[PDB]
Design a binder for this molecule. Structure first.
Ligand SMILES: Cc1nc(N)ccc1-c1cnn([C@H](CC2CC2)c2ccc(-c3c(-n4cnnn4)ccc(Cl)c3F)c[n+]2[O-])c1
Length: 236
C-alpha cells in the first residue's frame, strides 16, 4: 500500500495472508474470508503455483512476524479459478480457496459480506484498500498490515486513462487524480472493502495498475458484485 498507515489488531478480521511454501515460505497474496470454509482472492496469484499442497492460509494475523513454525494455519482443499481468466489486465481475475475444514469465527477471524442483492446502484464513498504490499514500486513486504482510503473512479474516466486496455463493467477503478495512495506489489488478491450503513462489503479484489499511485492512473479491481452468481454456484 502506497501512502497508507498501519492497522491495529482486530481491525480488518476478514483479511488473510496467503503464503506459498515453495521453494521457501513467503507471503504471496491477500485474500478475504467469505465463509467458514471459503476465501476469495485473485486468480493471478496462482501463476506460479504447482498445486494447493504448497499453500497455507493464515487468519487473525496483524504482523507477518507473528507467523512461526507452530502457528496454526488452514490447508487448501481446492483452488477454483474462473474458467475465462487469461491475465489480470483483461479481467476475470477471481479465485475461491476451499479450506480443508471450517474456520470457527472469532473476534480476529470474521467473514465479510458480498455486495448485497438490491444494492447494485449504491454509490460507495467509504472504501479502503489493505495489505502487506510495497509502499512504492521498488520496496519490500511490510510487517504490519497497512490501510488507505481511496475514492472510486467511474468506468468512463478509468477507460480514458487506460486506452490500451478494455475497462469493462466487471472491473472497478479507484485512485486520486494527483496520485499518492494506491495498492502496490504484494497487495493483490486482498479486499477493496467499502462500508455502507455500518456493514462492510467486499466490493473489489485488488488486481492491477500502471505503476503504483501515479498521477491519472487509478488502481484496477475485480468488481465482485458481477461475480456473485459464480461464487454462489461454486460454494453450493
Ligand atoms: C513482489 C512480491 N513479493 C511478494 N513476497 C509477494 C508478491 C509480490 C508481487 C509482485 N507483483 N505482485 C502482484 C502480482 C503477482 C501475484 C501475482 C501485483 C501486481 C500488481 C499490483 C497492483 C499495482 N501495481 C502495479 N505495479 N506494481 N503494482 C497497482 C495497482 C493495483 Cl490495484 C495493483 F493490484 C499488485 N500486485 O500485488 C505481487
Amino acid at each position: 500500500i502506497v501512502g497508507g498507515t498501519a492497522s491495529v489488531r482486530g481491525e480488518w478480521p476478514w483479511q488473510v495472508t496467503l503464503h506459498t511454501t515453495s521453494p521457501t515460505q513467503r507471503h504471496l497474496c491477500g485474500g478475504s474470508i467469505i465463509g467458514n470454509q471459503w476465501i476469495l482472492t485473485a486468480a493471478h496469484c496462482f501463476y506460479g503455483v504447482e498445486s494447493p499442497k504448497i499453500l497455507r492460509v493464515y487468519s487473525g494475523i496483524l504482523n507477518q512476524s507473528e507467523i512461526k513454525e507452530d502457528t496454526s494455519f488452514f490447508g487448501v482443499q481446492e483452488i477454483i479459478i474462473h474458467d475465462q481468466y487469461k491475465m489480470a489486465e483483461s479481467g476475470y481475475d477471481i479465485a475461491l480457496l476451499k479450506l480443508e475444514t471450517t474456520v470457527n469465527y472469532t473476534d480476529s477471524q470474521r467473514p465479510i459480506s458480498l455486495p448485497s442483492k438490491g444494492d447494485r446502484n449504491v454509490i460507495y464513498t467509504d472504501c479502503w484498500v489493505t495489505g502487506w504490499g510495497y509502499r512504492k514500486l521498488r520496496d519490500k513486504i511490510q510487517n504490519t498490515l497497512q490501510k488507505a482510503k481511496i475514492p472510486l473512479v467511474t468506468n468512463e474516466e478509468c477507460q480514458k486513462r487506460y486506452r490500451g486496455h478494455k475497462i469493462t463493467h466487471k472491473m472497478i477503478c479507484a485512485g486520486y487524480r494527483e496520485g499518492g495512495k494506491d495498492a502496490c506489489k504484494g497487495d493483490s488478491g486482498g479486499p477493496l472493502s467499502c462500508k455502507h450503513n455500518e456493514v462492510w462489503h467486499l466490493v473489489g479484489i485488488t488486481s492491477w495498475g500502471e505503476g503504483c499511485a501515479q498521477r491519472e492512473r487509478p488502481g484496477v479491481y475485480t468488481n465482485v458484485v458481477e461475480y456473485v452468481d459464480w461464487i454462489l454456484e461454486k460454494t453450493q
